[PDB]
Design an enzyme around this catalytic site. Structure first.
Site, mmCIF file in Angstrom:
data_model
loop_
_atom_site.group_PDB
_atom_site.id
_atom_site.type_symbol
_atom_site.label_atom_id
_atom_site.label_comp_id
_atom_site.label_asym_id
_atom_site.label_seq_id
_atom_site.Cartn_x
_atom_site.Cartn_y
_atom_site.Cartn_z
ATOM 1 N N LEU A 15 33.520 33.760 61.933
ATOM 2 C CA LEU A 15 34.197 34.962 61.466
ATOM 3 C C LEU A 15 33.550 35.414 60.171
ATOM 4 C CD1 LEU A 15 36.346 37.068 61.863
ATOM 5 C CD2 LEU A 15 38.082 35.370 61.325
ATOM 6 N N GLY A 16 33.140 36.681 60.104
ATOM 7 C CA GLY A 16 32.606 37.250 58.868
ATOM 8 C C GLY A 16 33.263 38.599 58.592
ATOM 9 N N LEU A 17 33.101 39.075 57.383
ATOM 10 C CA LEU A 17 33.544 40.395 56.955
ATOM 11 C C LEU A 17 32.416 41.420 57.032
ATOM 12 C CD1 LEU A 17 35.949 42.067 55.580
ATOM 13 C CD2 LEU A 17 34.691 41.666 53.460
ATOM 14 N N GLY A 18 32.705 42.466 57.821
ATOM 15 C CA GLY A 18 31.756 43.575 57.854
ATOM 16 C C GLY A 18 31.941 44.529 56.696
ATOM 17 N N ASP A 43 28.765 40.177 56.173
ATOM 18 C CA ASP A 43 27.675 40.911 56.803
ATOM 19 C C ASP A 43 27.333 42.162 56.005
ATOM 20 O OD1 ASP A 43 25.958 41.320 59.356
ATOM 21 O OD2 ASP A 43 26.901 43.298 59.088
ATOM 22 N N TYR A 48 23.631 50.339 54.158
ATOM 23 C CA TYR A 48 25.032 50.650 53.927
ATOM 24 C C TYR A 48 25.265 51.137 52.503
ATOM 25 C CZ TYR A 48 25.624 47.713 58.189
ATOM 26 O OH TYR A 48 25.547 47.132 59.451
ATOM 27 N N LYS A 77 20.071 42.829 56.357
ATOM 28 C CA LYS A 77 19.246 43.417 57.380
ATOM 29 C C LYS A 77 18.154 44.306 56.773
ATOM 30 C CE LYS A 77 23.498 43.748 59.977
ATOM 31 N NZ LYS A 77 24.457 44.338 59.008
ATOM 32 N N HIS A 110 17.050 45.086 61.509
ATOM 33 C CA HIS A 110 18.293 45.814 61.730
ATOM 34 C C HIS A 110 18.305 46.537 63.085
ATOM 35 C CE1 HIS A 110 21.688 48.026 59.340
ATOM 36 N NE2 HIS A 110 22.083 47.994 60.644
HETATM 37 N N1 LIG Z 1 23.718 45.587 63.302
HETATM 38 C C1 LIG Z 1 24.109 46.844 63.409
HETATM 39 O O1 LIG Z 1 23.418 47.756 63.830
HETATM 40 C C2 LIG Z 1 25.589 47.125 63.159
HETATM 41 C C3 LIG Z 1 26.250 48.289 63.650
HETATM 42 C C4 LIG Z 1 27.632 48.531 63.423
HETATM 43 C C5 LIG Z 1 28.331 47.563 62.690
HETATM 44 N N2 LIG Z 1 27.646 46.433 62.193
HETATM 45 C C6 LIG Z 1 28.376 45.490 61.282
HETATM 46 O O2 LIG Z 1 29.585 45.175 62.013
HETATM 47 C C7 LIG Z 1 30.778 45.456 61.183
HETATM 48 C C8 LIG Z 1 32.022 45.798 61.976
HETATM 49 O O3 LIG Z 1 31.807 47.005 62.767
HETATM 50 P P1 LIG Z 1 32.351 48.434 62.354
HETATM 51 O O4 LIG Z 1 32.507 48.567 60.883
HETATM 52 O O5 LIG Z 1 31.509 49.369 63.110
HETATM 53 O O6 LIG Z 1 33.852 48.504 62.991
HETATM 54 P P2 LIG Z 1 35.075 47.523 63.342
HETATM 55 O O7 LIG Z 1 34.988 46.288 62.555
HETATM 56 O O8 LIG Z 1 35.144 47.493 64.823
HETATM 57 O O9 LIG Z 1 36.254 48.507 62.908
HETATM 58 C C9 LIG Z 1 36.401 48.815 61.513
HETATM 59 C C10 LIG Z 1 37.641 49.741 61.444
HETATM 60 O O10 LIG Z 1 38.820 49.044 61.923
HETATM 61 C C11 LIG Z 1 39.870 49.142 60.972
HETATM 62 N N3 LIG Z 1 40.580 47.910 60.987
HETATM 63 C C12 LIG Z 1 40.223 46.660 60.525
HETATM 64 N N4 LIG Z 1 41.126 45.726 60.708
HETATM 65 C C13 LIG Z 1 42.145 46.397 61.335
HETATM 66 C C14 LIG Z 1 43.380 45.861 61.749
HETATM 67 N N5 LIG Z 1 43.760 44.589 61.620
HETATM 68 N N6 LIG Z 1 44.218 46.764 62.357
HETATM 69 C C15 LIG Z 1 43.853 48.094 62.508
HETATM 70 N N7 LIG Z 1 42.667 48.621 62.100
HETATM 71 C C16 LIG Z 1 41.817 47.719 61.496
HETATM 72 C C17 LIG Z 1 39.152 49.355 59.625
HETATM 73 O O11 LIG Z 1 40.057 50.088 58.749
HETATM 74 P P3 LIG Z 1 40.061 49.754 57.137
HETATM 75 O O12 LIG Z 1 38.711 49.338 56.664
HETATM 76 O O13 LIG Z 1 40.626 51.100 56.602
HETATM 77 O O14 LIG Z 1 41.208 48.666 57.039
HETATM 78 C C18 LIG Z 1 37.985 50.296 60.041
HETATM 79 O O15 LIG Z 1 38.421 51.650 60.244
HETATM 80 C C19 LIG Z 1 30.232 46.566 60.241
HETATM 81 O O16 LIG Z 1 30.991 46.837 59.111
HETATM 82 C C20 LIG Z 1 28.817 46.045 59.952
HETATM 83 O O17 LIG Z 1 28.930 44.983 58.991
HETATM 84 C C21 LIG Z 1 26.306 46.189 62.414
HETATM 85 O O1 LIG Z 2 23.263 50.722 62.088
HETATM 86 C C1 LIG Z 2 24.375 50.204 61.573
HETATM 87 O O2 LIG Z 2 24.334 49.069 61.132
HETATM 88 C C2 LIG Z 2 25.589 51.069 61.646
HETATM 89 O O3 LIG Z 2 25.248 52.433 61.940
HETATM 90 C C3 LIG Z 2 24.664 53.174 60.930
HETATM 91 C C4 LIG Z 2 24.839 52.873 59.572
HETATM 92 C C5 LIG Z 2 24.403 53.754 58.597
HETATM 93 CL CL1 LIG Z 2 24.530 53.326 56.920
HETATM 94 C C6 LIG Z 2 23.650 54.899 58.923
HETATM 95 C C7 LIG Z 2 23.514 55.215 60.285
HETATM 96 C C8 LIG Z 2 23.927 54.314 61.276
HETATM 97 C C9 LIG Z 2 23.648 54.704 62.702
HETATM 98 O O4 LIG Z 2 23.491 55.915 62.978
HETATM 99 N N1 LIG Z 2 23.600 53.741 63.637
HETATM 100 C C10 LIG Z 2 23.137 54.033 64.996
HETATM 101 C C11 LIG Z 2 21.616 53.827 65.098
HETATM 102 C C12 LIG Z 2 20.750 53.658 64.031
HETATM 103 C C13 LIG Z 2 19.361 53.479 64.199
HETATM 104 C C14 LIG Z 2 18.879 53.367 65.504
HETATM 105 BR BR1 LIG Z 2 17.078 53.062 65.820
HETATM 106 C C15 LIG Z 2 19.714 53.525 66.606
HETATM 107 C C16 LIG Z 2 21.079 53.836 66.392
HETATM 108 F F1 LIG Z 2 21.938 53.892 67.424
#
Ligand SMILES: NC(=O)c1ccc[n+]([C@@H]2O[C@H](COP(=O)([O-])OP(=O)(O)OC[C@H]3O[C@@H](n4cnc5c(N)ncnc54)[C@H](OP(=O)(O)O)[C@@H]3O)[C@@H](O)[C@H]2O)c1
Ligand SMILES: O=C(O)COc1cc(Cl)ccc1C(=O)NCc1ccc(Br)cc1F
Length: 311
Positions: A15-18, A43, A48, A77, A110
């Site tokens: 479990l981690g914090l996004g 994370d 970001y 990332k 990333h």
């Molecule tokens: N590798 C990549 O390309 C990539 C892409 C997307 C995400 N990520 C990482 O994954 C993490 C998580 O994904 P995500 O931010 O897209 O969305 P998520 O974790 O699926 O959803 C975040 C949303 O859910 C709400 N939320 C959190 N806990 C809740 C609860 N117990 N009940 C109701 N609503 C709740 C949050 O509101 P509040 O904050 O207002 O409480 C926020 O609006 C990111 O922050 C990032 O670190 C990586």
């Molecule tokens: O990519 C993340 O980690 C979450 O999504 C975003 C975050 C920020 Cl700060 C800015 C924009 C995105 C974002 O737009 N993510 C989607 C994305 C991005 C790049 C590529 Br190659 C494909 C694609 F689907």
């Protein structure tokens, strides 16, 4: 069990914090609260634009001796505009400086796509297509390997790599370190059975992002499905006397995935961590898997152009 063993021999908390979209004015307290209530994995990402504030929180809880550095698992990332050999070290070092760290536990490519270097995170042509870099994933991976050998990162990995791209890395000539992690989108609407089984079969740990379906994604539309509001998921939660979010977080944990829900709401940060004391049944799990609809939070038209766009 709270951690999973990686193929670099280190343990990662499941479990981690996004932190994507966490406002810089709120994320320092969010991370402080998270560590106070049990979280040991954060994370992050340079794109970001909040790593400095996340780092203020980590450094304060280190200084207060709430946690030891060894007990934290901090992930960041490499953004797309830094895939070039001579830009990777500095990108990593900027992230380290911002996070107030001397190493990362895990550093990910990333996205598989490299973009033109420069100030802009999404450099576009006049018709709105992303401008690629001619770098390829294999040369980028070798640059990631160098970071391990310089002590800046304990583990390297990938994110948003499809099957063929994972395979390309594993089949890389002269491969020195296998990826430890592939971090991909995963939730009951995008269950990922094929990519996960492939990754796991190769000893690559999968991290599920957007496990709650990212209700705060900036491109959300009315018509989009909503995990948190899906009555069938709410019913499984009610049966277990848990919240819908809690079920959505436990789901990937039982698939041997790592999961990183984001919140800046203290009560939700704590709620989301209270997922180690209940179990979903096999029937619950298969039922949640049945909701797949290949729906992605994370896709981006401007990038679909690129030779290595993964979807
Ligand atoms: N590798 C990549 O390309 C990539 C892409 C997307 C995400 N990520 C990482 O994954 C993490 C998580 O994904 P995500 O931010 O897209 O969305 P998520 O974790 O699926 O959803 C975040 C949303 O859910 C709400 N939320 C959190 N806990 C809740 C609860 N117990 N009940 C109701 N609503 C709740 C949050 O509101 P509040 O904050 O207002 O409480 C926020 O609006 C990111 O922050 C990032 O670190 C990586
Ligand atoms: O990519 C993340 O980690 C979450 O999504 C975003 C975050 C920020 Cl700060 C800015 C924009 C995105 C974002 O737009 N993510 C989607 C994305 C991005 C790049 C590529 Br190659 C494909 C694609 F689907």
């Amino acid at each position: 069990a709270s951690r999973i063993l990686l193929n670099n021999g280190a343990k990662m908390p499941i479990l981690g914090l996004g932190t994507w979209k966490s406002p810089p004015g709120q994320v320092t307290e969010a991370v402080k609260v998270a560590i106070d209530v049990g979280y040991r994995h954060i994370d992050c990402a340079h794109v970001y634009q909040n790593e400095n504030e996340v780092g203020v929180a980590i450094q304060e809880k280190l200084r207060e001796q709430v946690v030891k550095r060894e007990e934290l698992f901090i992930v960041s990332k490499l953004w797309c505009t830094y895939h070039e050999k001579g830009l990777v070290k500095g990108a990593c070092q900027k992230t380290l400086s911002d996070l107030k760290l001397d190493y990362l536990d895990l550093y990910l490519i990333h996205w598989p796509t490299g973009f033109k270097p420069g100030k802009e995170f999404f450099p576009l042509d006049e018709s709105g297509n992303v401008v690629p870099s001619d770098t390829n994933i294999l040369d980028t991976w070798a640059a990631m390997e160098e970071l391990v050998d310089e002590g800046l990162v304990k583990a390297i990995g990938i994110s948003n790599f499809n099957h063929l791209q994972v395979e390309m890395i594993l089949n890389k000539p002269g491969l020195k370190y296998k990826p430890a992690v592939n971090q991909i989108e995963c939730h009951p609407y995008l269950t990922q059975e094929k990519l996960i089984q492939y990754c796991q079969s190769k000893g690559i740990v999968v991290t599920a992002y957007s496990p709650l379906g990212s209700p705060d994604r900036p491109w959300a539309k009315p018509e989009d499905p909503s995990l948190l509001e899906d009555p069938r998921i709410k019913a499984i939660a009610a049966k277990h006397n848990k919240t819908t979010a809690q079920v959505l977080i436990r789901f990937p944990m039982q698939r041997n995935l790592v999961v990183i829900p984001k919140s800046v709401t203290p009560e939700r940060i704590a709620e989301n961590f209270k997922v180690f004391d209940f179990e979903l049944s096999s029937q619950d799990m298969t039922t949640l898997l049945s909701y797949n609809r290949n729906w992605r939070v994370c896709a981006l038209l401007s990038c679909t152009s690129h030779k290595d766009y993964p979807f």
